Amino acid sequence: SEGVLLGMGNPLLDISCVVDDAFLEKYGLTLNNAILAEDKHLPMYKELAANPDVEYIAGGATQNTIRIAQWMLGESNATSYFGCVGKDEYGDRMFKLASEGGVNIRYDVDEDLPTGTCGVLVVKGERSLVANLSAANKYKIDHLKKPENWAFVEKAKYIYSAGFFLTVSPESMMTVAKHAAETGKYYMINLAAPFICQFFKDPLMELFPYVDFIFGNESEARAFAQVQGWETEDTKVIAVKLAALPKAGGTHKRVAVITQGTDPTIVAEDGKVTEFPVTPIPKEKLVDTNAAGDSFVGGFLSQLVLGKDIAQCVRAGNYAASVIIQRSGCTFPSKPSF
Ligand SMILES: Nc1ncnc2c1ncn2[C@@H]1O[C@H](COP(=O)(O)OP(=O)(O)O)[C@@H](O)[C@H]1O
Ligand SMILES: Nc1ncnc2c1ncn2[C@@H]1O[C@H](CO)[C@@H](O)[C@H]1O
Ligand code: NA
């Protein structure tokens, strides 16, 4: 099933460090939040580089999801990934790691900007993200439309992008979403962060009629609900309302999947809510929750591309996230035991 799943996003190198409450207060950051880097965050990246516990791990939300799906599938080149990197060592490092894991990496390159990075600040297992997109922000629709890269869109039956890609190339997302609508394929996104639901609500709502599977966490679902004027904080209601939003075509229903950390995963399908409890990981065994949501999607998608039911997809998602939260960032052993 070569290239059955394609992802498109921002390939970033995670600069991860266990810090404390004072470091977040210093740079005005919030736990369980993601922002785009500002000039005031350049001293932060310098401080992270000098910290003795700093770790450099391949990141990027879509890339994490695709690498996890590939690990769960276990058949080389079942997945593909598009994204933009710089002509530097960080770009080649992520290329080599993901390719060796079995992902068919098709990176676009920027001539002048360095490869994108993300500050991952860990406090008692929880994380705060500060993305410096750099070359990831320069993804070109020209790369997507080149025959050798368009062939992997044609080969794919499932296409996924984290909502973070709406800040970079909403035109590339629309192009592949419209292709999927014309061919009976599945187009899927995540809400990614509250800032995406608030500041990128308009490109998000232009694409939403073409979304067959919408993924998100409870804070994103609540941020989306507040933005749309839905006077509710109930994630069960928000999940049903997300599935019920208009669709460009009736070929597929829209399934909404809302994760809630240690609380049950919510699925809205055909107007009914099903909840799937999480088996919590001991606080002792917990390293960090960075890439937990991305790995839940990766696990869910690995079963979805094999034709499994939605309950088996959620079970595989909870499994993949449980494995990843017992490691730093999006890191995993070489072979699964699902
Ligand atoms: N402490 C935990 N123990 C066990 N599983 C967890 C824990 N935290 C997260 N998970 C798993 O990771 C998934 C995603 O967590 P969540 O915090 O909702 O994601 P995100 O990274 O998008 O914030 C959960 O649905 C669950 O399966
Ligand atoms: N703006 C962004 N675009 C893409 N990936 C991002 C962004 N912000 C954070 N991430 C990624 O989110 C992951 C955790 O979900 C991290 O590995 C980090 O690299
Ligand atoms: Na992404």
Numbering used by the authors: 3 to 340
Reproduce passages from the article:
Adenosine undergoes ATP-dependent phosphorylation catalyzed by adenosine kinase (ADK). In plants, ADK also phosphorylates cytokinin ribosides, transport forms of the hormone. We discovered that maize and moss enzymes can form dimers upon increasing protein concentration, setting them apart from the monomeric human and protozoal ADKs. Structural and kinetic analyses revealed a catalytically inactive unique dimer.
In contrast, both moss ADKs were observed to dimerize already at a low concentration from 0.01 mg ml–1 (0.25 µM) and became mainly dimeric (MW 81±4 kDa) above 0.3 mg ml–1 (7.7 µM). Indeed, the diameter of PpADK1 (dimeric in solution) became smaller, reaching that of the monomer and demonstrating that dimeric PpADK1 dissociates to monomers during a ternary complex formation in order to be active. The electron density maps of Ado and ADP in PpADK1 show clearly that both substrates bind in the Ado- and ATP-binding sites, respectively. When superimposed, Ado in PpADK1 overlaps the Ado part of AP5A in a highly hydrophobic pocket. The purine ring of Ado stacks on the phenyl ring of Phe169 (in ZmADK3 numbering; PpADK1 numbering is shifted lower by three amino acids) and establishes hydrophobic interactions with Leu17, Ala66, Cys123, Leu134, and Ala136. The adenine part of ADP in PpADK1 is slightly shifted compared with the adenine moiety of the ATP part of AP5A due to the presence of a threonine at position 264 in PpADK1 instead of an alanine (Ala265) in ZmADK3. To form the closed ternary complex and bring the two subunits close together, the enzyme must be monomeric as shown by the structures of both ZmADK3 bound to AP5A and PpADK1 bound to ADP and Ado.
